[PDB]
Design a protein around this ligand. Structure first.
Ligand SMILES: O=C(O)C[C@@H](Cc1ccccc1)[C@H](O)SCc1ccccc1
Ligand SMILES: O=C(O)C[C@@H](Cc1ccccc1)[C@H](O)SCc1ccccc1
Ligand SMILES: [Zn+2]
Ligand SMILES: [Zn+2]
Lengths: 158, 145
């Protein structure tokens, strides 16, 4: 497993709209190795999520994990979910502020208003369609990672 | 092997300075799979070279086709003051063709996929292709020449 270099705020890769993964990439050693290298990168930095743009890959691939911490002690321990072409279908009206950091903004942490719950549809690495509702810290991480795919850093939301 | 979608002129990705490949990535399954997908994409499009930004990867990896050479972190160290005009096309600017003045000889330092430093000189057509692909790593399309 490879740890990849991470783009920092100021780098233009972080401001693009990432390109969808095409059907012929699904269920490929190419997509498995990309997910594996993203996963190894997130763990090396003690992250709970990562988006492909952060490792200079302008593609719609994110990982969402969760672990309990100071700010959310009842946050689940959740192993990496790889989400290909994730789409948030619905944001809850209920909104709560929560502590965020970013691998691309290692200097700063902040309070961000996020939907308490999001309905998300995505493809597995195999190309299987999944629809899940995320709540709480994992909802926040999914919103943060989709923002990365859309060229948005959390500091722009404070 | 995977054929990757190709960025077209107008996409911001083609206008960045691609990031160097890190020592971590050298001799990795990740880097071989990247080179294979780039190679498959080039062949499927009938191309004679490709750069990683063209497949939405902002990394300094190019292929030049002679059997294809993959070059990681290439740098043009030496070139002829003597220029040649050759017809160019681009996978990222479909159905566009133009004469571009290039150095007729280039000496290129690069890493292999295994991560050993190597030097090669290209003349003529492969020299034009190297210069075109290094331009892609620096956010330049051939139309701007
Ligand atoms: O930059 C990233 O995408 C990784 C962030 C994800 C994140 C999103 C929302 C809320 C918190 C984190 C990294 O995990 S930052 C490190 C971190 C870890 C746990 C809690 C807070 C910050
Ligand atoms: O955009 C690319 O990098 C791929 C081009 C490379 C090229 C650079 C300089 C001169 C010619 C080609 C593709 O091979 S374009 C298709 C093509 C093939 C043979 C001759 C001309 C154009
Ligand atoms: Zn982030
Ligand atoms: Zn080109």
């Amino acid at each position: 497993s490879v740890v990849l270099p991470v783009a920092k705020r100021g780098e233009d890769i972080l401001k693009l709209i990432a390109a969808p993964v095409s059907a012929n990439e699904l269920n490929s050693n190419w997509l498995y190795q990309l997910a594996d290298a993203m996963h190894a990168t997130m763990l090396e930095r003690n992250g709970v999520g990562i988006a492909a743009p952060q490792v200079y890959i302008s593609k719609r691939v994110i990982i969402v994990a969760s672990r309990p911490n100071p700010r959310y002690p009842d946050a689940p321990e959740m192993n990496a979910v790889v989400m290909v072409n994730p789409e948030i279908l619905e944001f809850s009206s209920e909104t709560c502020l929560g502590e965020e950091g970013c691998l691309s903004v290692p200097d700063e942490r902040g309070q961000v208003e996020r939907a308490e719950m999001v309905k998300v549809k995505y493809l597995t690495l195999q190309g299987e369609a999944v629809e899940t509702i995320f709540h709480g810290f994992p909802a926040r991480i999914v919103q943060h990672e989709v923002d990365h795919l859309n060229g948005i850093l959390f500091v722009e939301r404070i």
